[PDB]
């Protein structure tokens, strides 16, 4: 039960508070 931080890519996990698991095209990075 954890979350990814800013810049920490994620496959099926969501970014911690303040960040959101955004994916633009074929990339996946935690963006505000």
């Amino acid at each position: 039960g954890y979350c990814a931080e800013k810049g920490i890519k994620c496959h099926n996990i969501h970014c911690c508070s303040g960040l959101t698991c955004k994916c633009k095209g074929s990339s996946c990075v935690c963006r505000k």
Side-chain angles (χ1 to χ4, degrees), residues 10-29:
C10 49
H11 299 160
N12 215 80
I13 193 159
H14 308 161
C15 312
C16 307
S17 55
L19 310 151
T20 311
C21 206
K22 280 281 164 169
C23 284
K24 182 80 84 272
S26 305
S27 270
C28 280
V29 188

